[PDB]
Structure formats: structure tokens, C-alpha cells
From a paper:
The Mononegavirales order groups five families of monopartite, negative-strand RNA viruses many of which are highly pathogenic and/or contagious; the Filoviridae (of which Ebola virus is a representative), the Bornaviridae (Borna disease virus), the Nyamiviridae (midway virus), the Rhabdoviridae (rabies, vesicular stomatitis virus (VSV)) and the Paramyxoviridae (measles virus, human metapneumovirus (hMPV)). These viruses encode a large RNA polymerase (L) (usually >2,000 amino acids) that is crucial to viral replication. As a part of this study, we expressed CR-VI+, a 406-residue fragment comprising CR-VI and the adjoining ‘+ domain’, the variable region carrying the K-K-G-motif, investigated its MTase activity and solved its crystal structure. Besides sequentially methylating the 2′O and N7 atoms of small capped RNAs, CR-VI+ also 2′O methylates uncapped substrates and displays nucleotide triphosphatase (NTPase) activity. Both the CR-VI domain, which assumes a fairly standard MTase fold, and the K-K-G motif of the (mainly helical) +domain are required for the MTase reactions.
Numbering used by the authors: 1614 to 2005
Write the structure that this text describes.
């Protein structure tokens, strides 16, 4: 009925990152490029995320790990989370800082979560979310709109000391709209102006270009490259504050940092296994999948399929075909074939070198990525990651 947040923090994996402090001029080194082309098609950054269901941003980013000193120095009573979705990042934060209250905002588009479903699952009550965006319109929940920032203080009368943004914007102009509006607020708003200029915005950014200037009076303090970000892209987290503007992180600097982590570092597994979560992810991937996943359980799911496939097409009206239902068995077979491959495969360390091995030792790789959808593949990697951790 009542849980302690500190005990839940063992279900969250250790985070590996790289901080790139924004200094004056340059190193004048003309440093070499590090490249490694991993032959991977699957989202392997979900390998250590088996203990989470709706959102798993907390497995990738953490405030204690990245901006711990700033958290101690500023000592915020309230944290503002924008573009939060199911709120797993906010959930990890609630476990690391058990006395902090939250103001949550997420776009009310009804395509993605606009309620903290993961936070509720991890924390239990939602009592610490003093403002959950309830009763707000689609534009007052959209960080690219002035009205969102105008109603941010409707419950909390604490200044925007630290704002966390994990929104995926359409384009960089939409990101700039958010950053400009944040600046406009922290310099207009009575509450925030009273605190001063020591106000921060820690936002997700995709380093596309080079030498792109931040808006006027918006200075980047540091850039964080996370091990948990999709290898393929150029995603990073940038800590911004008020001050003489500088440049956004460049695609080149990000790639080297991103590459070093992939080549050098292993993914840390969670200290404890949340068996209810793993069960939910297993059932979400394949309906009726039980833990532990072994030869017996995989053959039991194959038995359940072989007896299910032999069903005579009898109903009232021909609306849902058995030939159409054979596509659901096709997906199920694809899943079992992969999990069987994982089970038969040797134990290794959680790294992209071993992941490339797992993928290039599997014959129906292209049939897998063609048959399973993006969310299904993410679920498949959560389950795979559990299987690999369970080994030896
Ligand atoms: Zn304000």
C-alpha cells in the first residue's frame, strides 16, 4: 500500500555517459576521428531496460549521475518535466531525490502518453506530482506554445531552477521555439526573475549540423552523450543556462564520444530484477510468455502455436480470417525463433561487439525486422536483455 523510493532505485541500471564542458576558443589539436561500423539493425539500447514497461528514459538519463552537483548546489524543491510521456525519467528522479515535488507536462496529442503511467507504476501514488497537467488543452501542454509557459506556475510558485525536456521535436526550429520561450519566460516571469539568472534547461537535442548558434542570451554549460541513446543517431542532452550565447554541439564531436562509449563500455545490468515488470514485458511481446524463458517454455509456446494454427474457419460473418490470423502466428514464430537463438547462443558481455555477433549469427535477421514493428522490436530487446542477464 506504501513504498520507499530508494529501494526501487536498484531496478534502474547504472548509467555510462560523457560530459563535454563548453570552454572558450579551442584545444588546437586537430584530433582524429574514431569510427566503427556495427552491423546492427535492432535497438540494443533497451538491453538493460527489462524492469520497465511504458517508458524507460530513466535507464538512459539520470539527474544524480549527470547534474548531481547542480542538484546539490541549487537544492530544488520542485522540478519541471516537459515532453515527459509516461514519466520514467521523472520516476528515477523521485527515487534519487525522495523529497522533490514535480510539475509534469506532455503534449496531449493522443498518439503518445500524456499521463505518467510509468511513474505511477514505479512510485505508486502520484501525490508528489503537484501538477500533472490535468484539465489543460493541447496547446497549453505544447512546449513550443507561449500559453504552456504562461500556465506552468498554475500550482507551483517555485522558480524554474531546473527544467527537464525530453520532447522529440518535428524540426530544430521547434526546438528553438521551446528554448526561446523558456528564455522569454525566465526573464519575464515574476517568480523566476526574483530567483535570478541561475536557472537551467536540460534538454534532449539531435546534433545534425555544426556551428549552429543558440538563441541570444542562451549559453550551453555542458553536453552529455548517453550510452543509452540509439547508436545510429546523434542524440545528446544539453544543459543550458542564461549567458552570452555559444554553439550547439556539433555532429562530429557527438559521434566520436558516442563511438568511444560503444567500443569501450559495457551496459550495466540492474542490481535487482523486477519480476512483475519482466512478466508484463514478456506478455506484451508474446501473449502468455512465462518466466524463466527456457527450452521447455519455448517448446510450450511452439506447442500452443501448432495446436492453435489448426483451427477450422467457422463464425457468423467472414470479418476476421484465419489466413489473416496466420500473420499473428508468423509474428509469434519470428519471436520464438529469435528467443531460441538467444537461448542457444553463448553468454557474453552486454556490449555492441557481442550484439553484432548475436545479429550476424542469426539467419532470418531481415525477416525479423520486416515482420516485427518498431515497438515489438524494442520489447524483443527488453526480453533478450533479461535472457542474457539470466545466463550463467
Ligand atoms: Zn516562472
Amino acid at each position: 500500500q506504501v513504498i520507499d523510493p530508494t529501494e526501487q532505485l536498484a531496478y534502474f541500471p547504472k548509467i555510462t555517459f560523457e560530459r563535454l564542458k563548453n570552454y572558450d576558443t579551442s584545444s588546437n589539436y586537430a584530433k582524429g576521428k574514431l569510427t566503427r561500423n556495427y552491423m546492427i539493425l535492432l535497438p540494443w539500447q533497451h538491453v538493460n531496460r527489462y524492469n520497465f514497461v511504458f517508458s524507460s528514459t530513466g535507464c538512459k538519463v539520470s539527474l544524480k549521475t549527470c547534474i548531481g552537483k547542480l542538484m546539490k548546489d541549487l537544492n530544488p524543491k520542485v522540478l519541471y518535466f516537459i515532453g515527459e510521456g509516461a514519466g520514467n525519467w521523472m520516476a528515477r528522479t523521485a527515487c534519487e531525490y525522495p523529497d522533490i515535488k514535480f510539475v509534469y507536462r506532455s503534449l496531449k496529442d493522443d498518439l503518445d502518453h500524456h499521463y505518467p503511467l510509468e511513474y505511477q507504476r514505479v512510485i505508486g501514488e502520484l501525490s508528489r506530482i503537484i501538477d500533472s497537467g490535468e484539465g489543460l488543452s493541447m496547446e497549453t501542454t505544447d512546449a513550443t506554445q507561449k500559453t504552456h509557459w504562461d500556465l506552468i506556475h498554475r500550482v507551483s510558485k517555485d522558480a524554474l531552477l531546473i527544467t527537464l525536456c525530453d520532447a522529440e521535436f518535428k524540426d530544430r526550429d521547434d526546438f528553438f521555439k521551446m528554448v526561446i520561450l523558456w528564455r522569454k519566460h525566465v526573464l519575464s516571469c515574476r517568480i523566476c526573475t526574483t530567483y535570478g539568472t541561475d536557472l537551467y534547461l536540460f534538454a534532449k537535442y539531435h546534433a545534425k549540423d555544426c556551428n549552429v548558434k543558440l538563441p541570444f542570451f542562451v549559453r550551453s554549460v555542458a553536453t552529455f552523450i548517453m550510452q543509452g541513446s540509439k547508436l545510429s543517431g546523434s542524440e545528446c542532452y544539453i544543459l543550458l543556462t542564461l549567458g552570452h550565447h555559444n554553439n550547439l554541439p556539433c555532429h562530429g564531436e557527438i559521434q566520436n564520444s558516442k563511438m568511444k562509449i560503444a567500443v569501450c563500455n559495457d551496459f550495466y545490468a540492474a542490481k535487482k530484477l523486477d519480476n512483475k515488470s519482466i512478466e508484463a514485458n514478456c506478455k506484451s511481446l508474446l501473449s502468455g510468455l512465462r518466466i524463466p524463458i527456457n527450452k521447455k517454455e519455448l517448446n510450450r509456446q511452439r506447442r500452443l502455436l501448432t495446436l492453435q494454427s489448426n483451427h477450422s474457419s467457422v463464425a457468423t460473418v467472414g470479418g476476421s480470417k484465419v489466413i489473416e490470423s496466420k500473420w499473428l502466428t508468423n509474428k509469434a514464430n519470428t519471436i520464438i525463433d529469435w528467443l531460441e537463438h538467444i537461448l542457444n547462443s553463448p553468454k557474453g558481455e552486454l556490449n555492441y561487439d557481442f550484439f553484432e555477433a548475436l545479429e550476424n549469427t542469426y539467419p532470418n535477421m531481415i525477416k525479423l525486422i520486416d515482420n516485427l514493428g518498431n515497438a515489438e522490436i524494442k520489447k524483443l530487446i527488453k526480453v533478450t536483455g533479461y535472457m542474457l542477464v539470466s545466463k550463467k
